[PDB]
């Protein structure tokens, strides 16, 4: 896989967030997690979690996986980075989101995923309080 660079335009929410991609507006939505939605326990520190990290960053890139790039929404399908560090890493890893929606072809970041997940889990941290 391969960095393409973005910027931010907003962002959303724990696992969506707008980025001009190739000159034009898209909403991402982050391969293989699922944050809580924001009227949910823990979704507006996801929210905030993954607010922070692309509004701060210096760089954004996008990076597409093997298989589909958007959804059935028409959202863009992708591991988001802040600074080279990956958005859908960091909110696993805070136990802010669950590994989620694995389909095949798209699952690249799979097992560093759960690795984080893992972590969080033995840590006790947020979703597994
Ligand atoms: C993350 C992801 C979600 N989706 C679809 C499946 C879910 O469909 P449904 O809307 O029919 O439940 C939805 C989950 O996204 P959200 O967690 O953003 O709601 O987006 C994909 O098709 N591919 C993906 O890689
Ligand atoms: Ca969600």
Same mark, same amino acid.
């Given at each position: 896989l391969h960095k393409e660079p973005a910027t931010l335009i907003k962002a959303i929410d724990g696992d969506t967030v707008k980025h001009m991609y190739k000159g034009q507006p898209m909403t991402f939505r982050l391969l293989l997690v699922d944050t809580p939605e924001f009227?949910? %326990?823990y979704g507006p520190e996801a929210s905030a979690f993954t607010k922070k990290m692309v509004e701060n960053a210096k760089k954004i890139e996008v990076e597409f996986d %093997?298989?589909?790039?958007?959804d059935k929404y028409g959202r863009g399908l992708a591991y988001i980075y802040a600074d080279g560090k990956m958005v859908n890493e960091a909110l696993v890893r805070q136990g802010? =989101? %669950? @590994? =989620?929606? @694995?389909?095949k072809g798209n699952n690249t970041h799979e097992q560093l995923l759960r690795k984080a997940e893992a972590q969080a889990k033995k840590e006790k941290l947020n979703i597994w309080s």
């Amino acid at each position: 896989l391969h960095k393409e660079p973005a910027t931010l335009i907003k962002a959303i929410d724990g696992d969506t967030v707008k980025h001009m991609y190739k000159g034009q507006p898209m909403t991402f939505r982050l391969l293989l997690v699922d944050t809580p939605e924001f009227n949910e %326990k823990y979704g507006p520190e996801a929210s905030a979690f993954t607010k922070k990290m692309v509004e701060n960053a210096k760089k954004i890139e996008v990076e597409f996986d %093997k298989g589909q790039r958007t959804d059935k929404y028409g959202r863009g399908l992708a591991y988001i980075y802040a600074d080279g560090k990956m958005v859908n890493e960091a909110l696993v890893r805070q136990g802010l =989101a %669950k @590994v =989620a929606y @694995v389909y095949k072809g798209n699952n690249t970041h799979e097992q560093l995923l759960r690795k984080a997940e893992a972590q969080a889990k033995k840590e006790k941290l947020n979703i597994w309080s």
